[PDB]
Design an enzyme around this catalytic site. Sequence first.
Site, mmCIF file in Angstrom:
data_model
loop_
_atom_site.group_PDB
_atom_site.id
_atom_site.type_symbol
_atom_site.label_atom_id
_atom_site.label_comp_id
_atom_site.label_asym_id
_atom_site.label_seq_id
_atom_site.Cartn_x
_atom_site.Cartn_y
_atom_site.Cartn_z
ATOM 1 N N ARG A 35 65.792 34.759 4.840
ATOM 2 C CA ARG A 35 66.057 33.673 3.902
ATOM 3 C C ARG A 35 65.303 33.771 2.616
ATOM 4 N NH1 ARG A 35 64.415 28.168 2.148
ATOM 5 N NH2 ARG A 35 66.298 26.819 2.112
HETATM 6 C C1 LIG Z 1 79.767 41.985 2.452
HETATM 7 C C2 LIG Z 1 78.795 40.991 1.806
HETATM 8 C C3 LIG Z 1 79.356 40.324 0.557
HETATM 9 S S1 LIG Z 1 78.439 39.700 2.853
HETATM 10 C C4 LIG Z 1 77.389 40.895 3.746
HETATM 11 C C5 LIG Z 1 75.948 40.603 4.207
HETATM 12 N N1 LIG Z 1 75.502 39.267 4.478
HETATM 13 C C6 LIG Z 1 74.161 39.015 4.419
HETATM 14 O O1 LIG Z 1 73.248 39.852 4.331
HETATM 15 C C7 LIG Z 1 73.819 37.528 4.532
HETATM 16 N N2 LIG Z 1 74.245 37.349 5.992
HETATM 17 C C8 LIG Z 1 72.346 37.116 4.549
HETATM 18 C C9 LIG Z 1 71.668 36.491 3.312
HETATM 19 C C10 LIG Z 1 70.350 35.988 3.510
HETATM 20 C C11 LIG Z 1 69.748 36.050 4.836
HETATM 21 C C12 LIG Z 1 70.413 36.606 6.117
HETATM 22 C C13 LIG Z 1 71.645 37.226 5.891
HETATM 23 C C14 LIG Z 1 75.547 41.297 2.957
HETATM 24 O O2 LIG Z 1 74.476 41.349 2.321
HETATM 25 N N3 LIG Z 1 76.823 41.866 2.775
HETATM 26 C C15 LIG Z 1 77.509 41.720 1.519
HETATM 27 C C16 LIG Z 1 77.793 43.116 1.054
HETATM 28 O O3 LIG Z 1 77.592 44.079 1.785
HETATM 29 O O4 LIG Z 1 78.278 43.313 -0.154
#
Ligand SMILES: CC1(C)S[C@@H]2[C@H](NC(=O)[C@@H](N)c3ccccc3)C(=O)N2[C@H]1C(=O)O
Lengths: 288, 288, 288
Positions: free
Chosen positions: C74
């Site tokens: 977070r």
């Molecule tokens: C595909 C996405 C747009 S969403 C995916 C993923 N999600 C996260 O990390 C988010 N769950 C998170 C924020 C803060 C604390 C715990 C987890 C992330 O980053 N990826 C992006 C990417 O790869 O471009």
Amino acid sequence: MDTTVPTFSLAELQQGLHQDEFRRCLRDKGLFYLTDCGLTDTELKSAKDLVIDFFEHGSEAEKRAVTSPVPTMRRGFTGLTGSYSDYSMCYSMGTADNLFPSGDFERIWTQYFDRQYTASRAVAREVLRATGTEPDGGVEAFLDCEPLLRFRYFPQLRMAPHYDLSMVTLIQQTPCANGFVSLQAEVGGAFTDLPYRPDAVLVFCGAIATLVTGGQVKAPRHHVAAPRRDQIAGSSRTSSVFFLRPNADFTFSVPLARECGFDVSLDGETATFQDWIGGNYVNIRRTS
Amino acid sequence: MDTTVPTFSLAELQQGLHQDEFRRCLRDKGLFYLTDCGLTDTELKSAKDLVIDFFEHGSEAEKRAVTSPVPTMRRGFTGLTGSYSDYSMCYSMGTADNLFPSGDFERIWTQYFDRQYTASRAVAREVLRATGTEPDGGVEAFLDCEPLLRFRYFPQLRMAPHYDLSMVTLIQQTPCANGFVSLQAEVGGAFTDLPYRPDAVLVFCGAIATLVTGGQVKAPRHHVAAPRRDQIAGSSRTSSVFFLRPNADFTFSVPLARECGFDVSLDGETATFQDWIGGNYVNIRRTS
Amino acid sequence: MDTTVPTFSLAELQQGLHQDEFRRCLRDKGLFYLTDCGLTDTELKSAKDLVIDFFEHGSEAEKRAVTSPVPTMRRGFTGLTGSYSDYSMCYSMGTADNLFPSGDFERIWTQYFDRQYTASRAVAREVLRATGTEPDGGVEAFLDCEPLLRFRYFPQLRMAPHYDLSMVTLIQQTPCANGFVSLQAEVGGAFTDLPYRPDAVLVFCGAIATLVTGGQVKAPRHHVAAPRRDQIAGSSRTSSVFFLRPNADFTFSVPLARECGFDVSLDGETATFQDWIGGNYVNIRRTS
Ligand SMILES: CC1(C)S[C@@H]2[C@H](NC(=O)[C@@H](N)c3ccccc3)C(=O)N2[C@H]1C(=O)O
Ligand SMILES: CC1(C)S[C@@H]2[C@H](NC(=O)[C@@H](N)c3ccccc3)C(=O)N2[C@H]1C(=O)O
Ligand SMILES: CC1(C)S[C@@H]2[C@H](NC(=O)[C@@H](N)c3ccccc3)C(=O)N2[C@H]1C(=O)O
Ligand SMILES: [Fe+2]
Ligand SMILES: [Fe+2]
Ligand SMILES: [Fe+2]
């Protein structure tokens, strides 16, 4: 940082010794071994003996009779062409609603449970005292809670990385015959072995300790490794895992939760454990 | 225990035959085949025919027009370099808010849905009668509920082990051309084949049957296997899975839930399905 | 359908240009690149520079000092024999409760955050205007919300298929030295590359946009691929992912939710985001 996993004597902590060492351990590591807490190898071996006999030698019918109708691993036996128990078997218990294979098992396991529950409450009382923490509703109502004990036999990752959502978790293991050290935790940003110690229990702080203390206690990530192959003869193992879990009605400050890392979606200023986790216990969590 | 998966004629159960056999089946197995319930192979083949034509021959544009804007597999089509539908395609429906590729599909699928919903209610009424169970609010309000039907085509595990969180689940399959039996369930602590039967539907009891009956009904674990390679030519298959799911407001006793294995974190004495599972339906659960 | 991922200039949309193209993009695709939104490569590189220096060269002790006691990703740093950070490292921030490695990092990252938050609100305002949507409680209260920014360094799937549960998500990437295109999304039922564009940010609509607009906006599935081996030298990459997430108290119509695919278990006629998702934010979801 020394990345050594420390050991504390519960009896010494209760007498006010090692206050700074303990408090810094909680903040920076969130795990330790605990001696002098009423948990011998001898009793581990006696409870371990009677359940392992049940696992190997209890009949389908006797297993059935202590299997819950929903396969939740909350109480009784969980086997978990062939069977789900090929990979592992479990025996679970709490303060009530227990399912026992016989009067002898019940006596032994009730006593073992009570000893673990007492030790867990006792170490938790020290974590709260060390951090100057008075839970909403007071200490004793907080610690008279919803524990769950699970004993798990693993045949020759095993468990993916997670942190626990307990106040504290007490772990007694039996060693692998071949010496492999399966349990690992992050300490100083690296994976540190957590071996069996015949004279001590391993304590992990869980996320409820972080929450209740306002972030003064770390909830470490940990996982269970699997051998190489040079080490896959004699790789079976057992663990007794005691989760000291809050009541549904445990109440905390929402803004305070936010301040220590909890990504809450809670409106208003206080909430309960049930508000946060929902209507079923969740014992562990991954960072992913 | 005989680990044979039994079969019951719904018509016979409704006339009060096989009361002990049925009740012991529910307690000890929690699954069975059901004949004489208004579900023919002929209709399976007619609904199956029209959807398989849509899956193979419907255009991107026609698929789009019956795809929900959030990919939840609740209604309409779910495809699920290349595509998510490479692995499998789905068609989902309920009592309303349906998305139909044409008037002919709608007529066929509405009728098929209604037949499955009637059979599901009917077998559920028998499970409740067999166990002497009166749900809070009465039987008919309980059974006028929130069903979900999913039909899924699998090209040549597939599905990890789980139990269902329905009252009951009705499964119609079509066989693999090569004879492989993909669906398996735990019976007597071992994995038992659950093959297509042209004259019968497979009923799994779900965790809501366990809950509502006070633990008189088992919710078995089951999984979907994948072939060897000797059996990976002609290994494609389809299944029609009907979940008879409670209303959000279905109310039960918290202490009773605890007594049968549910690891609830619910304060006070009664709760609703929404309290327990939260604000989105959860159709299945793993023991892990 | 043209399955080309479109690009829009935020400045042009704000002047009322391309209304039909934008609205059809939202309905049929739910993703696009956005130019003219105040997000340069230059700033990406400046925020990227200072965090990558921290990831490579910050000490265990400095990392510890900006690590939350519960490993939730977070706020602060998340490393994520050896370490969880072997696979990847993360830096997370919000509008408050931030953990910054120094005054210079704080200045740079605060500014970067604010620019992303402004752009996100601004594009969201256009999605709401394009669809004629007035959220319960009005637009500005809806957009003054609970954003989360995560920057993630990946050493040489990576991310399984999912849709986001945000209103919108803004993604800035840096390219792989070797040219491999890791980010993919479903467009026209097929996996389309989503490469770095130096002059633009990628916008994914999330499930809250679907919800709030009554189903006028698609929430696409997307995933992060891994190279072949011919492409596993120079395969490391970074991404800045900004989730524009509703307040806990965001209120919507339950029957309307049902109409667009949400499999809600909510009694009565309105509900809040907290009612639906529970007491912790859930940022992503799989269709399985
Ligand atoms: C595909 C996405 C747009 S969403 C995916 C993923 N999600 C996260 O990390 C988010 N769950 C998170 C924020 C803060 C604390 C715990 C987890 C992330 O980053 N990826 C992006 C990417 O790869 O471009
Ligand atoms: C790492 C752990 C401390 S927590 C982890 C795991 N957790 C559980 O079984 C617990 N979820 C459970 C209890 C009762 C019913 C269902 C499930 C367990 O045991 N492992 C311990 C270990 O390996 O030492
Ligand atoms: C084993 C099962 C009885 S339950 C399992 C699975 N469950 C689902 O698809 C269900 N989660 C679903 C319905 C609608 C929208 C999203 C998801 C399914 O189908 N399998 C059946 C089978 O294989 O016979
Ligand atoms: Fe654990
Ligand atoms: Fe199932
Ligand atoms: Fe995403």
